[PDB]
Amino acid sequence: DGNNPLFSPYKMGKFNLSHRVVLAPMTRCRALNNIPQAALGEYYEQRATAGGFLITEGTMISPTSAGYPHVPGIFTKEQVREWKKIVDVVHAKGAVIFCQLWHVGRASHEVYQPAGAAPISSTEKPISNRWRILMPDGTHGIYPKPRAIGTYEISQVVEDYRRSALNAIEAGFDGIEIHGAHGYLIDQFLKDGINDRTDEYGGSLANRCKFITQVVQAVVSAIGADRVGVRVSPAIDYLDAMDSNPLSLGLAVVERLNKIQLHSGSKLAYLHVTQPRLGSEEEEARLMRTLRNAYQGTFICSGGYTRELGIEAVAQGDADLVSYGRLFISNPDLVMRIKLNAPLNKYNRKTFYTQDPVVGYTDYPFL
Numbered sequence: 257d258g259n260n261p262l263f264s265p266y267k268m269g270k271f272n273l274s275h276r277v278v279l280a281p282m283t284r285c286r287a288l289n290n291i292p293q294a295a296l297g298e299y300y301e302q303r304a305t306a307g308g309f310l311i312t313e314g315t316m317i318s319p320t321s322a323g324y325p326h327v328p329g330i331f332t333k334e335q336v337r338e339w340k341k342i343v344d345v346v347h348a349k350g351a352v353i354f355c356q357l358w359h360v361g362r363a364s365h366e367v368y369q370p371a372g373a374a375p376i377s378s379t380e381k382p383i384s385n386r387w388r389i390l391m392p393d394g395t396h397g398i399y400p401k402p403r404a405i406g407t408y409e410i411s412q413v414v415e416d417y418r419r420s421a422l423n424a425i426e427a428g429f430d431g432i433e434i435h436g437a438h439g440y441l442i443d444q445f446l447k448d449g450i451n452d453r454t455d456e457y458g459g460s461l462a463n464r465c466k467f468i469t470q471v472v473q474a475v476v477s478a479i480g481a482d483r484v485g486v487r488v489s490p491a492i493d494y495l496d497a498m499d500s501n502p503l504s505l506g507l508a509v510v511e512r513l514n515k516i517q518l519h520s521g522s523k524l525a526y527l528h529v530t531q532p533r534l535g536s537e538e539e540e541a542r543l544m545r546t547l548r549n550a551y552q553g554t555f556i557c558s559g560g561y562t563r564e565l566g567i568e569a570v571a572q573g574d575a576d577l578v579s580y581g582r583l584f585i586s587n588p589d590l591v592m593r594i595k596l597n598a599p600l601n602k603y604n605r606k607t608f609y610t611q612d613p614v615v616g617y618t619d620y621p622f623l
């Protein structure tokens with residue numbers, strides 16, 4: 257229970273992990289011109305541990321998938337070559353690392369689109385003015401009205417994910433994670449609060465689940481189920497991505513993942529779910545527990561977790577692995593600190609998205 261169950265080995269498919277502290281995917285914006293830089297190597301290397309699992313920042317799968325400044329891409333030979341150098345360093349420390357494939361959908365701006373073209377999505381409806389997009393100059397902009405793509409273009413996006421999954425393997429990545437959460441492209445098809453389509457990709461839970469099912473299946477056939485992880489957030493309403501029945505949508509997603517595993521005769525690397533964060537917390541815990549019970553495979557929880565909460569989650573059987581975002585930013589050796597239960601450093605939100613390759617990136621001290 258308290259003898260820290262976070263440090264007991266765990267089998268994640270063909271990957272033998274030595275502990276359960278996981279680095280959650282986090283956009284840091286240091287990949288100048290969407291090209292991984294040596295700094296990304298320093299940062300990850302700094303946080304990697306023998307047998308530890310790392311999940312990279314969201315990564316572009318095409319020239320139209322970005323919505324943040326200087327986020328890494330993995331759709332060009334140049335990008336793969338730079339990633340490979342980063343993965344080698346990470347692998348040298350004995351860690352496992354998956355590349356998160358990320359497409360922002362409508363959460364973008366003309367400034368992030370080639371030829372200033374408009375962002376794509378499942379709908380033509382934009383994000384409310386309740387949300388402002390971070391601009392390259394450091395200010396905030398207004399999310400534009402997106403272009404509702406047809407069925408044909410949808411299949412092309414599916415191919416972009418598939419090809420990026422291959423490039424990831426080519427770069428040496430142990431696997432990839434499908435970013436299907438936080439209101440981005442895939443979540444824009446999942447959430448009935450956004451998906452207003454009348455074709456076979458909209459309406460019922462089934463149709464709304466079609467896109468992510470085709471994406472996961474596509475990458476599964478490309479690099480093998482055991483090297484694919486999926487992240488979703490049924491109960492996160494970030495960027496107007498809400499659903500009338502969060503838990504139902506999540507179960508529907510879980511059912512599809514269970515079938516894909518069955519049909520592929522192999523299990524996914526894991527299901528990764530983000531929690532919202534008292535009756536609210538007791539309600540969220542149930543939701544999280546239910547999704548976990550429903551999914552036949554490794555479950556990774558995320559969202560405001562602490563050393564105490566992580567220890568509890570694994571002990572109570574609510575999860576097999578616990579990812580940490582913010583605390584991992586200011587604590588390179590977070591794994592080590594959670595082990596010794598040492599004080600943690602504070603994080604500086606101000607330097608979460610700046611471009612400096614050191615300040616607020618790799619200059620947070622070790623114990």
Ligand SMILES: Cc1cc2nc3c(=O)[nH]c(=O)nc-3n(C[C@H](O)[C@H](O)[C@H](O)COP(=O)(O)O)c2cc1C
Nearest residue numbers: 280281282283313314558559560561580581582608
């Ligand atoms: C600066 C920053 C960047 C993030 N970038 C991503 C991302 O690219 N993809 C993603 O799925 N989640 C992203 N997240 C969400 C985190 O992965 C994670 O779910 C969150 O940090 C969990 O809560 P915690 O900070 O209490 O650990 C980001 C969070 C922060 C603070």
